[model samples]
Target chain A: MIRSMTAYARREIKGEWGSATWEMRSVNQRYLETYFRLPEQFRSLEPVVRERIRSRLTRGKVECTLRYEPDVSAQGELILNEKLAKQLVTAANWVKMQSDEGEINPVDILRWPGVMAAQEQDLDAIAAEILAALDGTLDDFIVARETEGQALKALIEQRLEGVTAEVVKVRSHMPEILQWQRERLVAKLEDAQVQLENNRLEQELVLLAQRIDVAEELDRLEAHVKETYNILKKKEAVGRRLDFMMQEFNRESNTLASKSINAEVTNSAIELKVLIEQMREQIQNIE
Target chain B: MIRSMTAYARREIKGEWGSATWEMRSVNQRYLETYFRLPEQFRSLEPVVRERIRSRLTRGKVECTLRYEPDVSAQGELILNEKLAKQLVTAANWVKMQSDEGEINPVDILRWPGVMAAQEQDLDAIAAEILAALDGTLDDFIVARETEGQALKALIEQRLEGVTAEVVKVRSHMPEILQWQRERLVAKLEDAQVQLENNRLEQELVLLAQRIDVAEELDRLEAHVKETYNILKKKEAVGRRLDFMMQEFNRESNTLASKSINAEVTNSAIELKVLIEQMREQIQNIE
Candidate 1:
């Protein structure tokens, strides 16, 4: 209830070496599965993240992406590659001697492959920064998810209260229902003008009362409501508990409807089931 | 025997992809260099042209060009290669931060190869066709270079023969001119009716011979002529070698003139120098 699974967060860290941006997005799933998009030089970092993200998230497909940019000023500067460029210039001079029909431009020389380039960028310097920033991203993510969870709880809270009101009516409406059934049975016999023995008539009435009784099912339904609201108020990710709690409400409500066929009693049970269903759908979105 | 740097060539090829025009110009210069103005879509084409032309021509101010007009009739899933484009934008942003160079230019970013490329013509295929067409253009180009180069060899040849003629006169003129100077000394004494000793007079003439001797400069000039002819006849770019040989001839001829007090000897040296310079100027247009 406190934290939901479906949210996105991103964080970044920058320094002399350059910068690293970490982005993580989690959505509902059966179990935690992490994937990454990293530069080729730092591809090995994917496995490292797979373990780290799964440790934090228990249920969702989490995609962790790292974007790293190396600073030319701090690390690799524009330095000419000497030996290769030397070979090219000498060759230029040689060709000039043969034909005397070319004037080799310095810019032309610079544009060649091995002539001008930055030094190889080093990821060893910034790999640690990536993980640290990723932790910060996760930190921001949990708070965002928790806020989402609070909103979802408000929606479920309203529906659960609606179910409570509907549930209580079953207790109040049962007596009225019983009186109506009893009147129907006596009138049926009077209409037929058939006089029966007192013991046989009383036994027939007892069988009808037993069949209509819904006290045990109502007691279980009330217990389920107390347990669900308790899980909803907890600080941890109580999404699974609330999810299972919804199925429990459905089981009890289904039975409540099966036993009560008298119009008013069956109507209250169906209404309770509808409220439970609304909350169950909302529960599916939570962590 | 020679290739003049001053020439121009243009050729065009048309295909389903569109049409491409290749134009090239060469002008006299002291060292080897080349330049290009290819469509930015294929500015990378510059390096390819650079290597090809550089191998063929040795020293001149040369301009190589390409004009491409993609066919309107061509079609493809004109797709922006998304993965390549995404990497490019990210790197562009990274580089932008490092240098604060500029805001990311969508048009500039798109101009990069592989960023926004047509999938069907696959530029790979188109570029191959362009290079093959370039090879054809280059094939025609060298013919123009050589025809002009042949005229350069003829002009330089005439002056070389003149240099040879002027060189021989100095040797033949040196002996007679020295005798005339000795006879003048003898006349000065006889007219005054005063005689010096034979040894003193001989010593005076010997001192004159030492001061005006130019056999060494003459021999070196002859050597330069033979060496230059050697370079000219060989099947290679001999422009730079010829250029250097011309300098050597000038050094010898200038000194030959400096030491020769006799009018005939001095005139011969001056004539040889004139011939050397005339040939040197023409070598500028040859490869």
Candidate 2:
């Protein structure tokens, strides 16, 4: 299946533990590269996160960001250490009796160490949940990538069909184009009133035919088209492969254009280039 | 975000317990719909799976298929209950001795009840893992969708520019088209030599001008073009809105064409329709 490297996915999971939103964005790249922005508590997840992304994707510059909103209400729930408060208060009363000085304020007791405790979040559990949510986000990211890839595949396939059509047009018109070239050359030579031996003239015609021959180029063009179709069927990264094929396509087309001695073949070569360039643009996004 | 509704994603996860593959496919639809093909053991996951898909996608016919391949080698491993096997073997031997029957088969003893046991798979754990893997796949799917959406946005924006350019062309040439219309009408009237009162002639000219005026159509066309650009900037499903805009564009262009009395406006109207049709074709894939 053809896959596009350009994709984006954002997943948000909210629960009692906390809420984590994972946003992943990727664009076409020559090689697979990853960057992550995770909360301090979940920073340890980088290696595993990178590995998870690498295992699924072969090419793209991917950026993953985590937006964590801790459950403030849950964490803010105060737990009064009744036993500790009582002990402190009893000690304060003993001190007051000994000193017979200023009165001890209840607010002072509340401010004392261990009097009020804020609940500590379970970092391990929250981290685990966030990692799991990240996995979910990655799944969505891959789906988005594949979806774009499918569209790109359809577009490139259409352009491939266009390339095939242009090649076929050139092939079908080959005889006529060659015939026109031959007649024009013959007419020019005759008009110059240059009398030559039949054998020599025949040899010259053969040489001209050889010079204008584009059969090999056309054959390679068809072969490239077939190879591209095969690549699309493969369930692996194909961006680099298709990029290579596009260069081959350009090479063949350039050769055809350079050897063209007739307008028909010249125009066909130009059309071939146009189609190849279109396919090339779409191929850049494939993975 | 402009999203192409058509997309696909496949994910495979292998662990010591077993392996599972998730395949998701979606195509453009007016509303979100989901279908699933899951193993009988995981059939209970349908609602959760459906809800997960529905939450992310607003429109598409989505299909989710899961293939679970349990570890056959692991499941096939049998542990011998030595005590039970021995008892069964002894019982078989005694039976053979008493009956003077054929020799007891060791395989039969092993097959006896409580002789050997195969470990059962942990369905709940496997199911949980599969669901987790599915979350990953979904993340990928959304990424793919968004990537294609970006590309589609770029394409539609280019065509929107085309529409604006054509509209500008018509707007700039309006004065010339109107001048040409007036001259042609005057020349025809003069050639016919139809004499009338000056007041009546002024009335005729005003009526003729009214019949050929395209100002209303031009204003609407420009307004529609602006509306399309606004819709493109929106980060949601704008397919239906753009589709409606195209119809409005066509409506104005048709009116302009019908009212055209000069060649320039007539051709400009034709160009406008061509651009509108191109935009409309592309808008169909957007979600």
Candidate 3:
């Protein structure tokens, strides 16, 4: 299904140990990229997290962050290392004996940095819960993108219709327009004092008429419109494909305008070009 | 008030000689470009038509075409080209003799090319009528663009709302997330046999936590959202400006996700990246 490249989604998971929340933000980019923010305790999960993102998204710059409350009561499970504590106490005692230092403080020694450690966590459970929450967030994210895509689809359809109408308007006048241009060109030739055989002049006029016809370009423009419409209706990522198609539309329009011998057909080609650009802008948002 | 770039407008004016129609087609483009299609007979008006398009369309690729369907029935005066007709008849008679043709086709010769020329038209009156019609077409074009812009505006607003909500959700879990990381970091330090004083370790944890905090990033994300909303509300074309903002959004979200120290926060940052991308995609469509 068509999805917008831009959207937001988040979910908060509360656990017995603490509550953690996830927030995701994404923006358009030429390629897919991701960033992650997790607490220091969960720092080891960065690689796994990045892998998760890479597996799902194909484009855009993505940022995902996780926030959690560390249970203060659980801090009790953390313990001071007795051996390390003993070594510090002994060292303090030595210092006291050597310099008559103030009374050796046991609490201060235990308070020394290396004596304590955080309680170990079950990695399997944490990873599973976080991943599950992320999966849910992804669901929300996709829905939001789809919603945006729907709106863009409507705008594109309207623009394509406008472009088609203008093309038709221009086509209707081609026969008369070509005839006028041929007559005008002959008049100019006569005024220039260029004498030519009647049959030869007629042949030249026909050739000129054929060269300046934009029927092929107009047909291609119509085909492009249909192709674009079909792509938009498909349930797939089509941003890059749509972008390429816009270039094709512009190419045909430019060629049509260049071949114009009549004002109306030329103008219609130019108008069609403008509409293509409008659609290009919107297509950039789709994925 | 961003406007839709896809639209069409046409106007017809009745004059002494005949009727003329002027049309403007406005299509979307990253930049403004214009082409004028004027009848070969009215070639001199090309510059004027070009200027008309430039003065009105602030953005988009515009093509203005002028179509004139002469009111031949309104030709109250007829001036025959006796000299040209006589020349054609004589030439045809000579051809008939050389080819051993039975009939001298005087009437057919008169119908041949260059046998007729239109009388001088009232240039000033035609120009006036065309210019007035052009004005009407321009008004219609602008109205169409305005209507399209309204729809674009609504879509952008909805995406912005989603982004704002994600930012809020991420912010709520900050304190807990920081503490969780600190505990985890300390635990890992001990597992690796990295000994440090207890008080000093607590101090390190606080510093590390402070370094990776994404509150500032969150603030910037919120600021970006507000700015985007303001730009969308403006009455001028803002595609480039919106594009630049999308870049900023991606950068901040990436940084936030990267600095995350926990799984949950990292996941959230990934989610943020996704949403920002979605939003940026939509922004690309704006004009």
Candidate 4:
């Protein structure tokens, strides 16, 4: 089962703490680059989540946003730090004694730092839940990637078929094209008032075959196509592998085009190149 | 101690596992807005760091960067998932057998995600150290804020003294100004041959006094300045409070400008407004 680097998924869960959302998006990249947007405190989970992503995916740039909203009613308790407040008031009175101009303002005392704080909502409990929820989110995310991967696979397979047909068409024309070339050369010799023994002409044909025959290129092209198909079936990242296969496919197409002795074979090689190019575009997004 | 919303601090720490740097910067804002750039795994520190900032500062836009680099030599152990690799190889062999085309490739199995991983460094240990290190960073950050805050305080106090001097000048000129206006009005009445009883003239003088007296505005301006000094002396978040006082100071300055009958007092009101405006610009950065 292959996975495409391009996909998106969103999942939400609710509990006693509050509701949270996990939104993930991935796109093709040269390497695995993951970014996360999680609530600040829960952001501590980033390392664990990053490891999870790395364990599952080897390529692509992934962005995950974990939106956490706390339930205010569930965390409505506020505690005053009476000790800190008392110490601050005592300090304020000292300053007042130094300059008996104004009394200590009650509002200032209330606004002093550490004078008030809220009860900590079960942070560790919520973090564990969020981590587990992230795993579920990944389930959807991987499904999305895999689903897109199949579509891309099908599209490449379609182009592979086109490449195969073009190769077959060129092979069928090979004998006729070589024969036609031989006859045209003989006719050219006759027109030039030059005569050659049939034996000598046969010897010249070996050199012509050496320059024009693309049987080796045809065999390699077909081999590359088969490898690409087998690669798609593997349950791992195949983008780089398939990407390298594209280069080999193009190499054969170029050699076949350059070595073609007939226009039909040359045009078929161009068609082959077109199909390979199309497949390359889709393979770039595969994983 | 007061704090300026604008400051910067950076600290670095090294341990057996690796080294990390904490860089922080702040600029004045209407509300508390914070952003962080931390290594993906340690990003969980953002919430605690943000709370630390909030405890120390009332208003600012803060950006923090925590750069962590792992010691490659210390974490050189690489573990292979033999189970995962065995399954992939066995599956690849099945595909090769079914096709009878080519043997399974070894490189693909190795490149598979989860087939290879590194031993995690002491992440929790490092996290604890980083959290404590962040506390140290905040210590320096708060000192930075306080240091800049004093400079801002001194600058505003200089303007406050200027404001007080302007009010004093305007007040000293007030009696002479009123006397000068009364004499000029009497001269105009005599020149126009308008004979008036002393009690009737006194009634007109009372009405003139209602328009030209700016003693209330001058007094209020000085009162606002005193309150501003008092607020600054307190070691609490005072930006909002000082911001309100700025508005009050501007109100009195505007009233004094409009009510002045003498050019000297009117100019002094303009100077008072200039001083108040200068202080307001500095007050915006206070916390």
Candidate 5:
């Protein structure tokens, strides 16, 4: 199934300890490029997250952002090390005894190393949840991309159908269009009062037919249309392939327009280009 | 932001105990409808999943499926209830003593109520993780829809511009078209050698002009186009709104076509309808 590069997904988890939100946004790009906005504690997740994104997406400038708010009520407790505090107090008293000029402040003793410690929250648990949450987010992200991809596929296929119809219309009308052009040319020559050998005139008409013929262009257009349909059926990243096919469609239509000898052919060529352009615009979003 | 109602998303989680995959698919609908295909063990999750989907989507028929494959090595262990088995055996012996022809099968004893049990997996933990996973998936789903919505907005607006241009083109050419029709009517009268009073001829022309006037249709067309642009700018479900606008657009175009007095007006009306139809097809996918 086709997938669009442009998408956005966000997941937030709120627990007694805190709340964490994961926001992912992506836009079309030639290649897959990922960026992350994570809290300092979760910065280590960037590479892992990048890898996860790379594994699923082939193209887009993707940004993954994380917002975490810790609940103060669930914060870790602060513990006072009584033995360390007592030792620091003794050292402070000795220093005071040695120098009468210095004050033995209790606050200074508490500030000493190892005197107080705050219990750390479970970093491993939080990290695990974040990773798990990311996995979940990516699941939705892929679906989001694929969903749009399916829509895009349907749209492009519709345009391709239009393009095919135009090509067929032109092909079926080719003999009539050419015959009309031949009669018009003969009438113009006769009105101009010009005379030529019958054999030479017949040669000139044949050459004119060759010059204005769109058979080659129409054949290539039909081939491109079929190839595009085939590409859509395959399960893989097809943006680049479809992008190239659009160029081929445009090239054939342009040639058909330039060589047109009648209004009908010219109009058909114009319609073909319009359909091709629409398909091109949609192909930019596919992956 | 607009969202395409059709979409697909899948998420997979692999842990020491097992692996789980969630697949979500949705298509456009008038109201939110959700279905779940889950393992029997997780069947109770349907209500929770449905509620989550309803909260995020106002329209679409969405399906959520879960596939859980447990690791053989980590599966719950089976235990025999020795106490219950012993009691059953004692009862069997008593029955046998009472009826000499009776035979006690070991398999039958093991199959008795509460004789054997399989330890249940951590339902609470799994449920919590599933909910968290869904949150992540929803985040991506919303983004995916928005991305496509943006693209659809651009496309519909482009067609609206086309419709507006055609409406303006016809409006600008109306005076000339009316003058040409008046002259054609006078020539027809002269061809039939009818000698009508000058005042009567003037009155008849006035009636003809009134019959062919498309001013009301043009005004409505312009108004509908503006309203469509306004709706596109709002951050709400605009698919139904756009769909209605398209009908209004088509109605005005049809009226204009029916009233056309010249090929220019007729062609312009046709173009307007074409643009409106294109927009309508795209709006069908929007939400």
Candidate 6:
């Protein structure tokens, strides 16, 4: 299925440790680029998060962020480092003896390095929760992308259908349009008294008809439409492919109009050009 | 209220002249570009048709085309150019004499210029029909864009919710993470035998905490998200605005990650980057 380059996904999980949330937003780009915002303790999770994003998305610049609430019990968990506390107290006593006017302050002593600490949690468990949350957000992100993709597909398809209809209309009128052109050319030749030998005249008329023919152009146009339809229906990134096809379509339509012998054919070619351009614009959003 | 760049619309009109169909397809683009295909006789309608596309679309390449099957009577009656035909016959005879040919060829005479003719239709009337059909097509195209835009809105909004949650998660843990870093730094300093007064040590800790602060980055990130949401809700082109916002989000996340002294804070920054990257990718495809 076609996917749009623009998408957004966010998921929040609240728990006793604190609330954790994930948000990801993406936009079209020629290549995949990613950004992350996680706490320093979770910095080790960067590579894994990147790998996951790469696996799920093909192209676009993406931004992913994670947030967590404070664990209220953290303050009570601090462990007093008795050894460091004793060392600080001994140093303070010596400084007081030298100054002859100082005393050890409890607040100042506790403020020393290693006087307070906390047990570190398992890095593996934290990584696991983050990765799991990322997984869920990624899934939701893909769904969002798919939904946008579907809408784009419908619009592009509708445009293609119109192009098909116009091509048909032009083809159906070609025979009559060519006949009229031939008659007008013949009339002009006679009015100019420019007739030649009978055999030579017949040869020239045949050549004229062939030179002005648009049947081949129309045939290729139809083929392009078929190929475009196929691409759109495929379950893959089809934007670049569709873009190339639009160029091809324009080339043929431009040739058709440029070679047009009658006003009607010229107008039809112009219309075809217009339709192809519209499709091109939409393809930019596709991935 | 975010509008989508992808859309499709079709309109069929039956009037006194006969029936015509208009189809429009729009896809995302930084700007609007249009293409048209019309019968040669309707060439004058080009500018008006373009105007129709412009009025409805904000930012996309819109392709619009018209196909008409006119009532038989509207097709001008065919008329023979008798004067020109006679001239062709005379010219053929003269050419035969010059070539010393014994016989004139009837087939050659019929194939000569002016042998066949056609009635010219009123250019003004055809132009009017062409313009009318295009106007109808434009209306249908806009309706299609609006419908798809609604869907896009839903997807983006859902993602924003995820991002908000993540921000909250990171904010809650910042203070604890920073405090842990200060303690670790002091312990390392002490191990290195760096001597300092009690007041001096306290001052150093405060400075370190300030340097590692990511509060500003987080605040700006949230602001950017809210702005993006607001822009998407407006029924106008937001491609450029969204692009700028993505840049801002990226800048803040990178700064936060780099300034982090604690492993936990750094990890949070990394996670934030991941979500921001995803969001950036999606924004590129918006209309």
Better of 1 and 5 by lDDT: 5
Query: Whose TM-score is higher: candidate 2's or candidate 3's?
Result: 3
- CA lDDT of every candidate: 0.71, 0.74, 0.70, 0.75, 0.72, 0.68
- List model 5 lDDT by residue over B136-173, tens digit each: 78778887778767778889888988888888899899
lDDT of 1 by residue, B1-287 (tens): 47777666667788888788877767678887788888988877777788988877777888777888776324443344556656766666677679966554343443467654545555777888888877877777778778767767887778778778877777687677567656656664453343334446556656655554466667788888787777889987787888788888878876665553453454455457556655775776677
The alpha-carbon lDDT assigned to residue B9 of candidate 3 equals 80
1 against 3, candidate with superior TM-score: 1
- DockQ (C-alpha based) per candidate is 0.00, 0.01, 0.00, 0.00, 0.01, 0.00
Place model 5 in a CAPRI quality band: incorrect
Off by over 4 Å in 6: A34-37, A72-76, A102-105, A193-196, A261-263, B1-287
lDDT of 4 by residue, A1-287 (tens): 88899889888888886888889999888666677777856655654786588678767889999998888888868777666556556544443443332456676666644456564556888787888888998899999998988899899989989988998998899888778878988998999999897698897777687778888778767776776777778775677657755765776788898898677887898888888888988888887
| Cα lDDT tens digits for candidate 6, A165-247 | 98898888888976776688779889999966678767666766776888877777777787778777878566655765675
Comparing to the true complex, what docking class would candidate 1 get?
A: incorrect
Highest TM-score scorer? 4
C-alpha RMSD values across all candidates: 53.1, 22.6, 48.6, 39.7, 21.1, 47.7
C-alpha lDDT of candidate 2 relative to the true structure: 0.74
C-alpha RMSD over true interface residues, model 6: 57.4
The true-structure Cα RMSD of candidate 2 reads 22.6
**Candidate 6 chain A, run of 10 with poorest lDDT:** A94-103
TM-scores of the candidates are 0.47, 0.46, 0.47, 0.48, 0.46, 0.47
Task: List model 2 lDDT by residue over A122-179, tens digit each.
Answer: 8887777778888898888888777777878888888889888888988888778668
| Reference-based lDDT, residue B113, model 6 | 52
iRMSD (1 decimal) for each model:
44.3, 32.7, 57.0, 43.3, 29.8, 57.4
DockQ of 2: 0.01
TM-score of chain B of each: 0.68, 0.84, 0.80, 0.82, 0.83, 0.77
Q: How do the residues B1-287 of candidate 4 rate in per-residue lDDT, one tens digit apiece?
A: 87887676777899768788887777678898888887889777767877887776667899888988776445544555667766766676677678986544343444467665566776888887888888898899889788878888899889888888887887788778668667756764553444434446665656655654466767777788788789888877788888988888877766666553543454465456556655776787788
List runs of model 2 lying over 4 Å from the truth. A1-287, B76-119
> Of all true interface contacts, what fraction is found in model 2?
0.00
